[PDB]
RNA sequence: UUUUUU
């Protein structure tokens, strides 16, 4: 019946785009932790550099609460901006965020103890607790410092041009660790080494300021655990995507790495589109499954409806990422994995093994791909 | 649920 087939297409599309949600919707308020973010009002290379090392040591300190790491990360990401407070208002948007700004004037010489501003709220108990935190590095860390080179932390910065080199190298490493914090973690990574080689070749990253892999893994762990930090990083990525050809040294880097962070955790969706709708010889095979084709059409509609934030569904860890899971289109997923194993050597390394992977349509895709080739 | 490469 033509009416039932037309009705079913409409029903399928409606059921999938009914999950778009509200762009400005605010969830019901739930308890949240208080986060203390440290702000430098003026551009002091000495103070800024010190705060960079302080926050790197807080992020890696074993005796540090989740709130302490979250504040240290927000401060570390905000070190480049000329106005720290106005850049921290971006972090405040997070619905799970309750950030308190603390203005720091300096550090006591020869110590990690903070010197709070008159307006800034810092007790003598907190200052001592933070100083003890900044000196609690893990055993896996060598030379008593996060960096690979011992002399780097001790180096004195008296110019803005120096702090910028140090800061941008550290933040390049932090962003590369973001690249696979929610998807790949607690395992050896080849891509991370490749990104570092690329950015050292570009001259963006300096090997004199590399961190130890243990510190990089600790930074990745701290970023993955907090939703405030990951939402703030999506805000920074969207700021980097709005730029034109003319841009700053920092947001050019952030856009370059956002190219690699984009569409993480949606590999099955984009590989299915690529190898099932990309090849002109797939319509003849999958023409029969109209229901799954309508599903993929409604998913391409849902992706556009989500907006720019759709590229960072995995970083944001939003529920709409369950719509793009291949268990809702298993036959076409199977066919596309078959086609892609022939056409892409790199795809073989990817784990396409699923409980629901149809072996018949996998082999249909393999034989179709090879047939066209030979 | 994710898991490749760019």
Residue numbers in the entry: 1 to 374
Please share excerpts from the published article on this structure.
Similar to other mononegaviruses such as Ebola and rabies, MuV uses a single-stranded negative-sense RNA as its genome, which is enwrapped by viral nucleoproteins into the helical nucleocapsid. The nucleocapsid acts as a scaffold for genome condensation and as a template for RNA replication and transcription. Here, we report two MuV nucleoprotein-RNA rings with 13 and 14 protomers, one stacked-ring filament and two nucleocapsids with distinct helical pitches, in dense and hyperdense states, at near-atomic resolutions using cryo-electron microscopy. Structural analysis of these in vitro assemblies indicates that the C-terminal tail of MuV nucleoprotein likely regulates the assembly of helical nucleocapsids, and the C-terminal arm may be relevant for the transition between the dense and hyperdense states of helical nucleocapsids.
The other MuV nucleocapsid with a smaller helical pitch at ~4.5 nm was reconstructed at a final resolution of 3.6 Å. This helical nucleocapsid is also left-handed and contains a twist angle of −26.8° and 13.4 protomers per turn. The rise of this helix is 3.4 Å, which is much smaller than that of NChelix-dense. We described this type of helix as a hyperdense MuV nucleocapsid (denoted as NChelix-hyper). The atomic model of one nucleoprotein from NChelix-dense was fitted into the EM density of NChelix-hyper in a rigid body, and only residues from 1 to 373 were clearly resolved. The C-arm is missing in the NChelix-hyper similar to Nring-13p, Nring-14p, and Nring-stacked. To double check whether NChelix-hyper was formed due to the absence of C-arm, we designed a truncation mutation on MuV nucleoprotein with both the C-arm and the N-tail removed and obtained the pure protein for structural analysis; the truncation mutation assembled into long and hyperdense nucleocapsids (denoted as NChelix-Δarm), which were then examined through a 3D reconstruction. NChelix-Δarm was reconstructed at a resolution at 2.9 Å with almost the same helical rise and twist as NChelix-hyper. Similar tilt transition will occur between NChelix-hyper and Nring-stacked; the tilting angle is ~6.5°. Compared with NChelix-dense, NChelix-hyper has 15% reduction in helical pitch and can reduce the whole length of helical nucleocapsid to 859 nm, which makes it feasible to pack the whole RNA genome in the tiny space of the virion.
